[PDB]
Design a protein around this nucleic acid. Structure first.
Lengths: 44, 121, 111, 87, 50
RNA sequence: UGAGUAGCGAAAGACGGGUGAGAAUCCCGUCCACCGAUUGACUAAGGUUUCCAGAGGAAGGCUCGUCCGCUCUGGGUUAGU
RNA sequence: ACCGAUAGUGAACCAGUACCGUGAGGGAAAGGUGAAAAGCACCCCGGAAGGGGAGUGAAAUAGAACCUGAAACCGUGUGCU
């Protein structure tokens, strides 16, 4: 039975990576909310 | 049959052939209460063939005994068919039955079954 | 007077321990040892060591003779529980309790 | 320069001394050409070839806190003449 | 079929009236000096005399 | 409380000798048994030290364990093609 | 004329941590030996854990799962039935 999650290194970085979040105006706001929260990992 | 010992028909008779052979190689083994109660018939009937010592009796014994090699002392290696017709058969030429004995030991750890000692008298 | 020995936090359920304990109450010292050595239970080796260690105290810390000794007290208490889990069907789980006991043996000369 | 950090003395390196092969710990961001030119000026020894490899941090836990060790770069140098004379 | 009512500890103790074990049935061995199982050997020396 | 009740996840093991406080379950040997267009041999993705040696038995292993993909201490990955 | 560890910030402990989700995101439980470590030299039962003496301490049922220690619940012995 095929499941929902099939891990992949390339996809996890090109969709949720740091440079993907920095490339759009609404992605920089995501990093600002996590910086204010105090998360040890800002992005995947 | 007499009792089944929780085994299939084909694999029960294979276990009895191994138990009978081992009681000839070492002449003293330790096993379960129920298994030893029915190895008596197999072993004691096999010595009867050995006493006769016929060609028809020897081929009728080769269909129950396994193929192994005897090597304990420095002498030449021997089989199990040769040993039964050459050494065991000469110790009971004056005895009418009762070739084996059973001695109880007690329950064993982890299982609760009792072990017994069976050997050729 | 009375000598005692205690063993704490033994990985055996208290309900199973008390089955063997009721067979040695008031018995002779040699009788109690013989009974524990001839039973094929799980707690028989454990309880015997507590009894044999209680007899050693009566012969060393006090001036007693170990031929008239009797078992005056023998009971099992309970200790902390180890809580594990087991996965059942349909994605849920059930709890598993791993219980422990405290075993005590008291030997009395009499008087 | 001070590219080399420490010598490596292990069970596998002991049998590698019979072939005039020495094991050193080097800086992480150097190439084996730089390591080649560092032995020749410290011990004054002519070298033949240099091998090098990289490792990964190991998760080692002591007490209650988990952490990682440092990444290690290890180099094996083959000598045609002379001897380094490690004590 | 779930239980309809909680079981009190009076019923539980009554039910376990016959939940018990007994002595193995040991006898003295007149070679070792200590008790042994009937129809079995002495564990200290392996003497099933007689 | 249900209760020492349900279950313990497809299946063939037997005996001899050792270790050990403790062995049906750990090692060595013999016999029997099962797959063999695969339960055999490589490798991509993914996991990231689970790989090796010497020690240990609280917890994990649906039982036991002297054993382990579990604990401690040290090791292991070498390219001009 | 505010709280005193289920309270007070989610966080009195290395907490936005464990952990859960592809992701945005959600989000815990855990304080107390003694004035002073003076943390049990030594003897006995084991393979060890643990226990009985001796000793330190005003107190060791203050022995590091450590200030007091209620109830549910689980065991032993006894007077009446």
């Amino acid at each position: 039975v095929k499941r929902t999650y099939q891990p992949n290194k390339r996809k996890h970085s090109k969709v949720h990576g740091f440079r993907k979040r920095m490339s759009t105006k609404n992605g920089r706001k995501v990093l600002a909310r996590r910086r204010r929260k105090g998360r040890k990992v800002l992005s995947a | 049959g007499y009792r089944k010992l929780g085994r299939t028909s084909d694999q029960r008779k294979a276990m009895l052939r191994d138990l009978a052979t081992s009681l000839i190689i070492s002449e003293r083994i330790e096993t379960t209460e129920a298994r030893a109660k029915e190895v008596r018939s197999v072993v004691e009937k096999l010595i009867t063939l050995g006493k006769k010592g016929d060609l028809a009796s020897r081929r009728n014994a080769a269909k129950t005994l396994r193929n192994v090699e005897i090597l304990n002392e420095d002498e030449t290696t021997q089989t199990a068919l040769q040993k039964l017709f050459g050494e065991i058969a000469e110790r009971y030429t004056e005895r009418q039955g009762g070739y084996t004995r059973i001695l109880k030991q007690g329950p064993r750890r982890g299982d609760g079954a009792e072990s017994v000692i069976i050997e050729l008298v | 007077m009375e000598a005692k020995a205690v063993a704490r936090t033994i990985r055996i359920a208290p309900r199973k321990v008390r089955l063997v304990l009721d067979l040695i109450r008031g018995k002779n010292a040699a009788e109690a040892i013989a009974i524990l050595k001839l039973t094929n239970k799980a707690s028989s080796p454990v309880i015997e060591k507590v009894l044999m260690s209680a007899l050693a105290n009566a012969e060393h810390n006090y001036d007693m003779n170990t031929d008239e000794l009797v078992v005056k007290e023998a009971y099992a208490n309970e200790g902390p529980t180890l809580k594990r889990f087991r996965p059942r069907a349909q994605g849920r789980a059930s709890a598993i309790n791993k219980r422990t006991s405290h075993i005590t043996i008291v030997v009395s000369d009499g008087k | 320069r001070d590219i080399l950090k420490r010598p490596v003395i292990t069970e596998k390196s002991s049998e590698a001394m019979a072939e005039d092969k020495y094991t050193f710990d080097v800086d992480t961001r150097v190439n084996k050409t730089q390591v080649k030119m560092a032995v020749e000026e410290i011990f004054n020894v002519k070298v033949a070839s240099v091998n090098i490899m990289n490792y990964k941090p190991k998760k080692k836990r002591m007490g209650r806190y988990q952490g990682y060790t440092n990444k290690r770069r290890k180099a094996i140098v083959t000598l045609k003449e002379g001897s380094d004379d490690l004590f | 079929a779930v239980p309809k009512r909680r079981t009190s500890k009076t019923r539980k103790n009554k039910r376990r009236t016959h939940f018990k074990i007994s002595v193995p049935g040991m006898t003295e061995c007149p070679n070792c000096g200590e008790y042994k199982l009937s129809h079995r050997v002495c564990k200290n020396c392996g003497s099933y005399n007689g």
